[PDB]
Amino acid sequence: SGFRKMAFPSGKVEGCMVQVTCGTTTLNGLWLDDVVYCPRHVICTSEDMLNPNYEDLLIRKSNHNFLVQAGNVQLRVIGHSMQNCVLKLKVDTANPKTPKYKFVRIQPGQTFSVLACYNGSPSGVYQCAMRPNFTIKGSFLNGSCGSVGFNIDYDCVSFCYMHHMELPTGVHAGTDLEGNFYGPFVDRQTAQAAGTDTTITVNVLAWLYAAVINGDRWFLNRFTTTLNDFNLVAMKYNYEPLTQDHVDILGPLSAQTGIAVLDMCASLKELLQNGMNGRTILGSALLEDEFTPFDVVRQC
């Protein structure tokens, strides 16, 4: 048994983190080629944050107002522009540690690693999923704004997230690397409400398939259900509704095993009504929903 939530090795990302300072605010930036990306609210004092006029604030700034520091080497800002909610700082030197990279926008349910940074120093790495209410549940202290999220292909780093804000509920909101927020959030200090967080049903189903592959079976039942009956019940437990798209994605898993998808849904419905009754599933005492189908049918 055993199924550890593993994060990607962070090496390639660590040599791209830098420190950006404007006036008195300092946060983290991302140095790729000859561009440094960082959140635009770096140009705000705490008093501008209630109703920032980003265009007003940026026209009044000069290249020499931005201190960029890659360890002990201080870069020179040669120009700048603003793309949505991210600020792009062109510098005179390219980063020689630039990996092969890509920008992707993810959808809720997907997972990625986060390299938590403070003042341009990496401090830790963890693995997480984008929640259905477009928030992330991680450990970001003051100064982590600008930490980034990524996945790693064969050699290619896919950057998908950059941390902007902490919500009063304790969770964290951010943009893709083109500066478009995930979810309905804005870079203001106004009262923002995260929606209801729900369990990622398709993610739970892929994990339970990995359990039958790894020997566990005590939770299977002889029943089957329809997609509509299941969603009527899952909704009752704050579970995300399942779509045909989700069913097709699980296909190969239900091919390696004998169990049709709507079978596993009937089992999952029984687990919700009864609980665990002390037992575990792949050494876990809770239903895990932060392992995608792709992850499961790749590292069987």
Q: Using CB under 8 A, list all residues that contact a second copy.
A: 1-12, 14-15, 115-116, 122-126, 128, 137-139, 169-171, 214, 283, 285-286, 299
Q: How far is the CB of 229 from a second copy (least distance, A)?
A: 27
Q: Residue for token digits 């080629």? A: 33
Within 10 angstroms of residue 269's Cβ, the number of other Cβ atoms is: 20
Q: For residues 139 and 238, which CB has a smaller minimum distance to a second copy in the complex?
A: 139
Residue 172 catalytic? no
Q: How far is the CB of 6 from a second copy (least distance, A)?
A: 3
Q: For residues 232 and 300, which CB has a smaller minimum distance to a second copy in the complex?
A: 300
**Under 8 Å between Cβ of 125 and 113:** yes
Task: For the chain, report the end-to-end CA distance as a whole number of angstroms.
Answer: 12
Long-range Cβ contact pairs of 292-298 (< 8 A, separation 24 or more): 292/109, 292/110, 292/111, 292/129, 292/202, 292/203, 292/206, 293/202, 293/203, 293/206, 293/249, 293/250, 293/253, 295/111, 295/206, 296/206, 296/207, 296/209, 296/210, 296/253, 297/206, 297/252, 297/253, 297/256
**Under 8 Å between Cβ of 99 and 12:** yes
Q: How far is the CB of 248 from a second copy (least distance, A)?
A: 26
Catalytic residue among 16, 44, 145, 160: 145
Among candidate residues 189, 187, 191, 184, the one with its CA nearest the CA of residue 87: 187
Return the C-alpha torsion angle 118, 121, 127, 129, nearest 10.
50
Return the C-alpha torsion angle 289, 141, 187, 61, nearest 10.
-140
Return the C-alpha torsion angle 99, 105, 106, 111, nearest 10.
20
Catalytic residue among 16, 22, 38, 41: 41
Six token digits for residue 283: 């050494």
Q: How far is the CB of 287 from a second copy (least distance, A)?
A: 11
Q: For residues 135 and 225, which CB has a smaller minimum distance to a second copy in the complex?
A: 135
Among candidate residues 58, 37, 34, 36, the one with its CA nearest the CA of residue 48: 58
Residue 145 catalytic? yes
Q: For residues 3 and 230, which CB has a smaller minimum distance to a second copy in the complex?
A: 3
Tell me which residues are annotated as active site: 41, 145
